[PDB]
Write a protein that binds this DNA or RNA. Structure first.
Lengths: 167, 260, 134, 117
RNA sequence: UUGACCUCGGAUCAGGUAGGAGGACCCGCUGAACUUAAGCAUAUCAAUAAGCGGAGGAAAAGAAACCAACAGGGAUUGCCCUAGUAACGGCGAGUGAAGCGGCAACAGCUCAAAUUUGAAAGCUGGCUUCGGCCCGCGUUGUAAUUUGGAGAGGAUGCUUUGGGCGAGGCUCCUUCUGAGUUCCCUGGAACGGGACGCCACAGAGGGUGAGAGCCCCGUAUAGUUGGAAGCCAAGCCUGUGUAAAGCUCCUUCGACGAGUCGAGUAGUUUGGGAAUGCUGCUCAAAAUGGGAGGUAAAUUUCUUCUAAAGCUAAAUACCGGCCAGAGACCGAUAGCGCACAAGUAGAGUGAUCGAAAGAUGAAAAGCACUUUGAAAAGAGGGUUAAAUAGCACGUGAAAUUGUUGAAAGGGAAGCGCUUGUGACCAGACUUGCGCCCGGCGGAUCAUCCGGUGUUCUCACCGGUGCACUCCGCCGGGCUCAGGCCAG
RNA sequence: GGUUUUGCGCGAGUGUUUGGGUGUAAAACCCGCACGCGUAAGGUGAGAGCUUCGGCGCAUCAUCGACC
RNA sequence: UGAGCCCGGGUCGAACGGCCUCUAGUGCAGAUCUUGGUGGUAGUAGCAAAUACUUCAAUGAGAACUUGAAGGACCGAAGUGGGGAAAGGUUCCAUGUGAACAGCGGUUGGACAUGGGUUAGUCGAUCCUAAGCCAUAGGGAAGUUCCGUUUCAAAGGGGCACU
RNA sequence: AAACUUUCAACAACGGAUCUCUUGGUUCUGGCAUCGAUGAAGAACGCAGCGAAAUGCGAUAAGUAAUGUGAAUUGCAGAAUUCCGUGAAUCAUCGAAUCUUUGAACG
């Protein structure tokens, strides 16, 4: 209170704070969503146009009429009606409509490069010395001590030779 | 403020002194010393029953009664006599439930204010528009100090269909004084019965009229109320053949000759 | 109707800002309209007043008195037009404070800064005129 | 029942509509960052414990490791593609396992997964 | 003799760090009484006020030694109900949760217990040519790997990849963007009244000599000029080392926190002697272990977790800080003590206590000059729309006082009813209506025809009707009705 | 927080406003799941009111009942 | 009927009222009520002791209490004297004013306004310790901080030497 | 008859009510997170041509540098500005400086 009275009495200017916000309220960039997002609509209204789902949970109230963004067995094992011990781990082997959704499906299905990994210069030399001395005997290469000092298995040596194209 | 009249040190002098038993400020070097305090009768004292923010400012009203009132407000808006009784200049407009073609209000046809003003003049809502314009004058009282400087009359209310008319007519009608715009799916009794008085002049669109059946068919737990009377014309009921055939003969006249 | 949340409609705050404005702000408030000949020449409606301008008073007791601006007294929101004066008791002449909103500029004091001011206002006016036109 | 000093602890909710706008803007902020993604995470279907409520189902915290493996979704990828994982819940019955496995396959049918980079 | 190590010291040694303020909200310690009820005492106020210590934009809590008894749930936090329920109390005054359930928000992790042992692989300095060098710390353990709904090691086969620029973009400031000063009247001054216009995604607000959308600042929407710092990012350069990572399988392994649980006791606390929790003291553990719960179900079967190490955003609080927007609030004895050079003047040794006090005028145009007075001032004269606005300054009530005008007064005045005198006044009235003659001035006389509107039989327009009919005036006569007091 | 009476809505149901969704944005409009409170047939005599003049008999009271 | 309502005349200058609903910090003769202002008492009580004052002239608009001179009285070195400590802070000097204060007046003043005035190697402080207090070593205390003052403190000085 | 006491009226006083106004308060809501040994909060003394207070600043002292704007400040006096310009201003912004004695206060 005394500080506030002092400021009103002082000749120093008032530091008007601009309305800056920690989190942005609209998408930005050069992607499909940012180029189709309408700033004056709501979250559900924008997603309904996109053909996507905004909330995967339970509906907690009444929505607008047009809203579409808020959602033999011998062994008798229930899982038999669900099928189509190791699975893929970095991707999923996944199998009239709005423009945004159709554009999104095209970006997800666009073929991309892989950037195949090569082998080091010394690794090729170690492999080449192996094929020079033992030919195509992976079992002999594994048992060699001078040329295979890390005692790698025949299966691992065979796999590396295939990647190098040395059979 | 909770501390108004309390941030002082006062104590009653006692009973044996020939002065009122009221707390008095201690000290001795000011005009304030020895003055009464802490009382609602005392200058610079605490007020009686200080106003508190917990006062029940808002009122809980049944949704059924809210929808009943809106239905009554809409029905009274179709009654021509009630429109005049509420101060609306309805004399040059036909078809009191005035329905304008949605083709003349959808798109940029009305987003220009000059175009929106022209449409109101053509349909017959004109004289109600400059009625608001000529009625503006300064408020009487301290409301001027507190941000309510002027007051004026209400004009026509435009009810549209946002999904057919396109929500762009709102900006056309925004600047015109008195003219208020309201979507069909969300009607306001504060806008339908101003001041508690029924009979507001409303100009509809063709799309809004079609949607008006759908909006009341979608309200859950609400049906259109059934009145307690079927015919509201008392003259027809009393002067009907059924009633008059079973009545007794009159026992007198409106004015009776006094005998003595 | 005001829409942006940063705008205020308070009478108390508007009167405080107007009467406690700095000198730079007061220059904008002390603007005067341009004459009809100047409007069709520069495509500019108004401009802040300054010392060199020539004005014609169009409101007040001085009906249609013309003269050159002599002082821009920003501290009391008044300007001093030459030969628009009143005599004190002693007979010494003192200027009469005229508000810029009561005058119209007939001749404009020209310098590189004010040609830049007129060009910027014209650029905006022609931008929207063609935007509204087509 | 005012034997204590209640007047100094009285909370008035005059910010009820203000907080709702703040909550709605926070939900919009999440959609701004996660533009194509939903603002929530997929949660399983669970049964309420008590005999009073055991005839009704609701949403749980996250999916069990067993029912995540039966669906065909790796553990370390599930929190990354918008699936909540709960390592504390056990199945204990085929009925809970089947219901949540089917829920996951329905989620996989509707999914659009973009290339990594 | 010399030299290590350990421990402890010096230095204005090289580089750092803490204290104080603020304390609205937050984390702890400590800690009352007035009051309420009851023979008394416990209880209640209250696990509050005062006092002390410690943080932030939030803090705290937090990923079960949990809830449950279920067809199960699944870190923490908050709202709603649960619920004035359970439970504790002379079952007084009273006190008083929690699980489930609907919702807001959601996020998971790091160590200690292992040997890198085929290579301390780790890090603080300070000298630099910024290439790199030495001094040390440390094996009484710094890296990588693992953290018990796990994991390791091998084998096997798929799958996965790291750095540097970066156009441009978002956020925030910043420049510019509509229309009457047209004519008349009142007025000192139009921003008032009348007329004719214009703009409006702008008729919010303010100023300008009196109520201004168009006189001015701004107001609305889209753009547009320049800048700031964060974050994102199309693309472009590169990458590498037999380097890392996810899983699968198994004739191999799988370390999990002690003066801590617990028993006894004292104080305090809770709805909670299975002690609800905490603290002090005495004693002092375990490994198919330990904790909690369910259960008469025949023995203590069954269920559910893993304590004594640690980190973590969000939903939540906010009388304080930087701002911003509002009100059916108050309007100078009100509203904060303070609308003013107010925590000021002033009082007290001190801790502390603590006021009163806004308004000339649109513009000082704040009265030149003359005269009387020692002066203060007065009178002329003047400014102004106004001095019946002269800084003892908007408007200027009452108490109280002066002058003038009228009246009354042999020890109260004032009050009720009724005349009279004197002064002073509001009404009422001024003529209307209708007949009979005369002079007129004009065709909305009756009827008929056509069109139109309606209440479908009533009207209105146009024509015919160019005068014993109809309408207004004037000059006479008469009737009626007209104010006050009376016979 | 209880309680009595009057008006209003719906009525074996009632209560949108913890919250969510729109909005011209503290207004107004809408409602998915729980939740609070309440709920899941006789004889005789009088008796308002009907009557086809024969009788039919509301509510409520008295009595004999029936059931839990 | 009444609480009240309306109009006329005067003053004034910038906003206000009727109708119907909504709302409340909504109606005063009292509370030895609060704040402010104003009366009768009343031109009344009263304006004390320190024996004591008088004449001419000057200043000044104005002189019992301002000055010069003269007279009559007084303090009587334990003073009604001349200086300090403590305390006060410009009251000290000159010029000017007379709104307020000096319970009459004032031309006078410790009043008001405008200027001026305090000169040190030797006078005091500055240095020393006294009764006594504080820090450090340590030890209590939840803590703000308390004890402790030479204590089971590595606590302070100085010298010499063909290097 | 006057004087005195009382009543009313007009004018004039005393006093500051009433009406009107308000760069103030009070309450609610929203965005944001920023004191200090690089010396804070508080206290003191200086600084303007003419200033006591309030305000601003610190011996560079009602202020310096930089950026923007674009022609003032004003109570008086004195300088300006060439205006076709690194440039007035008790202007705004603000990233660089100066920053007396103390005060956690540190020879």
């Amino acid at each position: 209170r005394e500080l506030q009275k002092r400021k009103r009495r002082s000749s120093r200017p008032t530091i008007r704070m601009p309305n800056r916000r920690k989190k942005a309220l609209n998408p930005a960039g050069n992607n499909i969503i940012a180029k189709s997002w309408n700033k004056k609509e709501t979250l559900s209204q924008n997603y309904t146009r996109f053909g996507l789902v905004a909330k995967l949970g339970k509906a907690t109230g009444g929505t607008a009429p047009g809203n579409k963004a808020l959602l033999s067995e011998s062994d008798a094992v229930p899982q038999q009606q669900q099928q189509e011990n190791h699975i893929r781990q970095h991707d999923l082997e996944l199998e009239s409509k709005p423009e945004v959704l159709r554009a999104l499906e095209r970006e997800a299905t666009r073929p991309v490069e892989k950037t195949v990994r090569h082998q080091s210069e010394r690794e090729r030399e170690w492999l080449q010395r192996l094929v020079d001395k033992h030919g195509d005997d992976v079992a002999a290469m594994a048992r060699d001590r001078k040329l295979n000092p890390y005692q790698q298995t025949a299966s691992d040596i065979k796999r590396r030779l295939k990647k190098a194209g040395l059979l | 403020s909770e501390k108004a009249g309390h941030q002082t040190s006062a104590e009653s002098w006692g009973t044996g002194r020939a002065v009122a038993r009221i707390p008095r400020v201690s000290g001795g070097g000011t005009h304030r010393a020895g003055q009464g305090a802490f009382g609602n009768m005392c200058r610079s004292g605490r007020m009686f029953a200080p106003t508190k923010i917990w006062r029940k400012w808002h009122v809980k009203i049944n949704q059924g009664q809210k929808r009943f009132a809106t239905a009554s407000a809409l029905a009274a808006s179709a009654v021509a006599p009630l429109l005049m009784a509420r101060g609306h200049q309805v004399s040059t407009v036909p078809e009191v439930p005035l329905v304008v073609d949605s083709a003349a209000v959808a798109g940029d046809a009305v987003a220009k204010t000059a175009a929106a003003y022209k449409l109101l003049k053509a349909i017959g809502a004109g004289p109600d528009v400059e009625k608001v314009k000529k009625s503006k004058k300064l408020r009487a009282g301290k409301g001027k100090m507190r941000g309510r400087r002027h007051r004026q009359r209400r004009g026509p209310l435009i009810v549209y269909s946002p999904e057919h008319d396109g929500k762009e007519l709102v900006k056309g009608f925004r600047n015109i004084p008195g003219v208020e715009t309201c979507p069909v799916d969300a009607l306001n009794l504060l806008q339908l019965a101003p001041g508690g008085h029924l009979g507001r002049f409303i100009v509809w669109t063709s799309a809004a009229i079609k949607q008006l059946d759908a909006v009341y068919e979608s309200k859950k737990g609400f049906f259109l109320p059934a009145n307690i009377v079927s015919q509201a014309d008392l003259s027809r009921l009393i002067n009907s053949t059924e009633i008059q055939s079973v009545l007794r003969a009159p026992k007198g006249e409106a004015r009776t000759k006094r005998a003595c | 109707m005001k829409v942006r949340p940063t705008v205020s409609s308070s009478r108390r705050k508007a009167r405080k800002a107007h009467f406690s404005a700095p000198s730079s702000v007061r220059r904008v408030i002390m603007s005067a309209p341009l004459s009809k000949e100047l409007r069709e020449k520069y495509n500019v409606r108004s401009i802040p007043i300054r010392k060199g301008d020539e004005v014609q008073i169009v409101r007040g007791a001085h009906k249609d008195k013309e003269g050159k601006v002599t002082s821009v007294y920003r501290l009391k929101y008044v300007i001093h037009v030459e030969r628009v004066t009143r005599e004190k008791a002693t007979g010494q002449t003192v200027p009469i404070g005229i508000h810029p909103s009561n005058v119209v500029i007939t001749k404009l004091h020209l310098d590189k800064d004010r040609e830049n001011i007129l060009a910027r206002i014209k650029a905006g006016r022609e931008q929207v005129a063609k935007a509204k036109g087509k | 029942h005012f034997r204590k000093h209640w007047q100094r602890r009285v909370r008035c909710h005059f910010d009820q509509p203000g907080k709702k706008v703040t909550r709605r803007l926070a939900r919009r902020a999440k959609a701004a960052a996660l533009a194509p993604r939903p603002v929530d995470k997929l949660r399983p279907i669970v049964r309420c414990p008590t005999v009073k409520y055991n005839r009704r189902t609701r949403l749980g915290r996250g999916f069990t490791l067993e029912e995540l493996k039966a669906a065909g979704i790796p553990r370390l990828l599930a929190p990354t593609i918008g699936i909540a994982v709960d390592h504390r819940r056990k199945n204990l019955s085929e009925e809970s396992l089947a219901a949540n496995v089917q829920r996951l396959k329905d989620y996989k049918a509707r999914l659009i997964l973009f290339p990594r980079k």
